Design a protein around this ligand. Structure first.
Ligand SMILES: CCOC(=O)c1ccc(OCCC2CCN(c3ccc(C)nn3)CC2)cc1
Ligand SMILES: *C(=O)CCCCCCCCCCCCC
Ligand SMILES: *C(=O)CCCCCCCCCCCCC
Lengths: 268, 56, 62, 5, 283, 62, 268, 50, 132, 5
């Protein structure tokens, strides 16, 4: 705008939380769909839903990770990364059913003398490959669901040889997007690129996507967030630079059905 | 006055990421803070201040 | 010459504007009580003394 | 007379 | 539209009954009181009622100045080794029992307050000197303001605190106060605390008194004799009378049946048996 | 601004409404005397707080 | 009604919970006021409120107590008795402020050959008397707030003599309603009587009552439920009879303000 | 000074405001009699040397 | 503006003097009042005033001071700082009475790698404390 | 003037 408004400068407000950014590269709305509540024509559980509004639909900041020249990539699953986040988590665990959309805001700033580009991908149904060559589909629920902590990509497939006490975890090779497909094509998924000369952040608005109108949030993740270094971090002449990446996520239009006693999962 | 029954709460500031500088740039800097009232702010029951006095 | 004005009634009895009456007895204005019928102004000359009017949703510097 | 307000 | 001073309902003439209507039979389990008048259970004549409930209206019940405290001050000889006594009173209706009991018929209240001050003085020693007429300063010190430490320190300047300068022998002093609460009504009872004990925090830090809200609820009255030290000592007392005017009350409560023990609802051992002996079949 | 109201006259002289006059001298309502022109209400919220309205001639329980 | 409807037979439904009663004695609505949400004209915190609706406003059943010929009486405080009840409790502890109304349904059935009458009283601001004769207003937060478990009335005032380690608890003498006033006048408070020949239950609908529009639910109880035997339990010729009393309470129109991290109280 | 109200940075409900700045008006702030001095005088015996 | 105008780029012209700035943060007008000449309704000395216009109302540059890490602060008083400035000073000293408004432009540039913040305050009646 | 009642 003529009196100063810009595509790089955004303010987002949800509940009692506000995010400001002075160096954005617009925002992505996945598949052109803004989040919405479940319509009566697509509804299925007949009981009155719980809709927590401002208490759950607000910005939760997860633990900050660190980007270095050794960094192969990081991944998170939704709703899993938010499972212990305030009243969103409580509402999630007290109900059999739940659905939610999300605003994902990835934060990474550096300086006009740094280089590097992060691919921020939102994958619907991000099924990842496990660590075994003798058995298939065997990653334990505990290993499959890291919570806020997330997981990482590796540059090398290294098979779990302990047949008597199997590790039962994923082994996500980065150029294969951890799922057997080439990373260069991951751009057909909703994404943004944090290229350090251009922007400090990525912002993706994600609708609820599923083959069902509502589902078990505890048994099933709808979206996976994959962040990979498309171009490695570099600074001045320092052989070992580091810059933080902070992930902040807000649930949107979340509703819950089937209230009963709280689910206490075996997470270890 | 400080009173638990009418306590206001807590302000705190944190680093979301970190301050990043290049080389040849100062690695330490200051921030200044300002406070003011919003248009919905009011005060009542006029009283004497403890911030000035006159011994003798 | 009686002046009649409204009270802002706070705590009401279990009992319509309530008024009070005032008469000035003296020729000099200095002798008069304080009316307390005062006006408020907007803080702009102190809070926004800048030459170009600011729009709070726009960048302060452009 | 009475100046009202 | 029913005024407090309106006359109560007339008794209507009522004749004999042989019916299926049963006004006398009821069930108090429901929580209701049976709305019966004499013509429901006995034959009545027509009476044109003239009596009114005017004097039992909430205003009328409280429209009286009640003693809430007696403050003592003095003005000694300059030569004495004891300090000139000025008085400090934490303002409340709870230091005396009578008005407290009337207000405690209700859980909550709003009122404007009229304060009237009766001041009396006397001589202390079998001495024979004199005192000229005393002027008294009654200063209100709201919570936050500097409380006086000496009868003559800077605080008595009152640039912003309200003060009354009373002359001995004149009509008793009087002021009005608005509804000054930080709530929408005064709480006569507060089932709670002003602090939350937090697990993470030490026991001592989380502790507070049961039933007590703002530690310094409304400030204090500080009173002094403005006159300088006189060779003959005079002692004076200030009796404070409180009248709740323009009053409203909510949620009725049973009256205090046993003696008051402190600012809360606590009762002391030995004061708990108010009722007298009387036999079931003795008129 | 003079307020004129009726007295409820009890004992009459061997002597038509009798009135009294009131003028408020102060700006703050708190300073005002008590009007005593109060209203009465029906005791129902305390005496009959039941959800289904009771008919006194009918059985309370049915 | 002509085709069978009655004052004794009620069905109450809130959220996914339904109560049936075939032997009621109508219902009481305290001070004639049904619960309502906070109006804009009486509002005070400016932030968007959290209103949990069906997830919190449903029937919670507390631990069943037992009525015997030795029973002097029982008491509970609200919101305290519901502090650990599902999503009502979570919402209570995550917010600085909260307000709520309640439907209280006291349950006690016996047989046409038993006798006894329970006074069920709802007291606004039910401040109780402590156990000390040397100090006043000194009941600890822990002792003042028993949670669901409630407290009991005693027939005898017995003063805490341990001056070095004071018990710091209440000593509620029953004929003095635990507060210095005579029990016979407690009927000016909203109440019902469970007289065993007439009804199996008491039902009281309670509005939010306070001198403020909203307050700290953790620091302050708004209502006290007092249940006392007005006429002692009796059965056939058994010298020691017993019948259960079950207390079921539902929050109504509850809203919360001031969201932040969860309060973890020192309750022991 | 940035003219912000809470609805600029957080989600807000509708509140009908009743508070006033009446007592912080310049008149109200100064409408109190303040002590500015204490003057001492006397009336001695005719015979005194002072 | 759409064809380039900005709050940071100002040009000020008074008399034969012009100031350009490419990095400003708007301008302050004290108490919202622009300077004005004395009105007949507020006038007091009855004699015809001297009004020097372009000869006095122009930009005078005072001696440049230096900011360092030891610098605690600097102060000036008006009209005193301008007392020896051209025809403003002459007009000031030839008359018993005088009134004036001012445009104050404080100049301090450095580089994108420096830090520091100067508070520039204009105080009406700035009475200062003495050394005793 | 006179407010009557
Ligand atoms: C919680 C228990 O106590 C009360 O609710 C209660 C107790 C006292 C009440 O009075 C209000 C407090 C003050 C208000 C101001 N006040 C003043 C004010 C000015 C002067 C000169 N003198 N006294 C005197 C009393 C009102 C309510
Ligand atoms: C306007 O003031 C006309 C009505 C006056 C009514 C009588 C006023 C009361 C007596 C005041 C006397 C004069 C005081 C100097
Ligand atoms: C309405 O009040 C108009 C008539 C007033 C008649 C005179 C009132 C008596 C004098 C009151 C003086 C003012 C008191 C502050």
């Amino acid at each position: 705008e003529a009196c100063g408004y810009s595509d790089r400068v955004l303010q987002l407000t949800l509940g009692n939380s506000t995010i400001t950014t002075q160096e954005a590269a617009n925002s992505v709305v996945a598949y052109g769909r803004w989040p919405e509540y479940l319509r009566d024509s697509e509804a299925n559980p007949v009981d009155q839903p719980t809709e927590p509004d401002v208490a759950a639909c607000r910005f939760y900041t997860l633990d900050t990770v660190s980007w270095t020249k050794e960094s192969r990539g990081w991944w998170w699953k939704l709703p899993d990364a938010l499972r212990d986040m305030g009243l969103f988590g409580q509402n999630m665990y007290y109900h059999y059913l739940g659905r939610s959309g999300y605003t994902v805001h990835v934060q990474c700033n550096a300086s006009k003398f740094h280089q590097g580009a992060l691919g921020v991908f939102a994958v619907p149904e991000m099924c990842l490959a496990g660590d075994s060559n003798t058995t298939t589909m065997h990653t334990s629920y505990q290993n499959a669901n890291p919570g806020e902590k997330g997981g990482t990509f590796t540059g090398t497939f290294t098979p779990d040889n302990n047949q008597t006490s199997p590790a039962r975890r994923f082994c996500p090779v980065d150029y294969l997007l951890g799922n057997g497909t080439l990373l260069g094509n991951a751009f057909v998924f909703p994404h943004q690129i944090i290229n350090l000369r251009t922007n400090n952040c990525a912002t993706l608005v994600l609708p609820y996507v599923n083959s069902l109108s509502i589902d078990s949030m505890v048994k099933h993740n709808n979206w996976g967030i994959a962040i990979l270094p498309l171009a490695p971090l570099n600074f001045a002449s320092e052989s070992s630079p580091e810059i933080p990446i902070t992930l902040t996520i807000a649930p949107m239009c979340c509703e819950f059905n089937g209230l009963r006693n709280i689910t206490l999962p075996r997470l270890q | 006055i400080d009173d638990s029954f009418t306590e206001g709460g807590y302000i705190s500031v944190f680093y979301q990421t970190r301050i990043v500088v290049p080389l040849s740039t100062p690695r330490e800097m200051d921030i200044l803070g300002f406070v003011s009232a919003c248009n919905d702010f009011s005060v009542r029951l006029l009283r004497d201040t403890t911030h000035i006095e006159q011994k003798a | 010459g009686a002046q009649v004005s409204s009270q802002k009634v706070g705590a009401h009895e279990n009992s319509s504007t309530i008024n009070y009456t005032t008469i000035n007895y003296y020729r000099d204005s200095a002798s008069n009580a304080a009316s307390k019928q005062d006006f408020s102004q907007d803080p702009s000359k102190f809070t926004e003394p800048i030459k170009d009017v600011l729009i709070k949703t726009a960048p302060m510097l452009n | 007379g009475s100046s009202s307000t | 539209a029913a005024t407090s001073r309106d006359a109560l309902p007339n008794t209507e003439a009522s004749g004999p009954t042989h019916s299926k209507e049963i006004p006398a039979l009821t069930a108090v389990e429901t929580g209701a009181t049976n709305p019966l008048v004499p013509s429901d259970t006995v034959q009545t004549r027509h009476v044109v009622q003239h009596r009114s409930r005017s004097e039992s209206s909430i205003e009328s019940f409280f429209a009286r100045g009640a003693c809430v405290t007696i403050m003592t001050v003095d003005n000694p000889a300059s030569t004495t080794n004891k300090d000139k006594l000025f008085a400090v009173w934490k303002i409340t209706y709870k230091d005396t029992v009578q008005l407290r009991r009337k207000l405690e018929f209700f859980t909550y209240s709003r009122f404007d307050m009229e304060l009237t001050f009766v001041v009396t003085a006397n001589f202390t020693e079998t001495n024979n000197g004199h005192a000229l007429n005393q002027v008294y300063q009654i200063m209100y010190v709201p919570p936050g303001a500097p409380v006086p430490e000496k009868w003559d320190d800077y605080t008595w300047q009152t640039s912003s605190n309200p003060s009354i300068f009373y002359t001995y022998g004149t009509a008793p002093a009087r002021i009005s106060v608005p509804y000054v609460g930080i709530s929408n009504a005064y709480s006569h009872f507060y089932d709670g605390f002003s602090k939350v004990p937090l697990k993470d925090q030490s026991a001592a830090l989380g502790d507070s008194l049961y039933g007590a809200a703002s530690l310094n609820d409304f400030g204090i009255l500080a009173v002094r004799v403005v006159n300088d030290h006189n060779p003959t000592k005079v002692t004076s007392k200030i009796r404070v009378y409180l009248k709740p005017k323009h009053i409203r009350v909510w949620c009725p409560r049973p009256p205090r049946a046993v003696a008051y023990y402190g600012p809360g609802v606590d009762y002391k051992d030995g004061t708990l048996t108010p009722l007298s002996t009387k036999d079931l079949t003795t008129y």
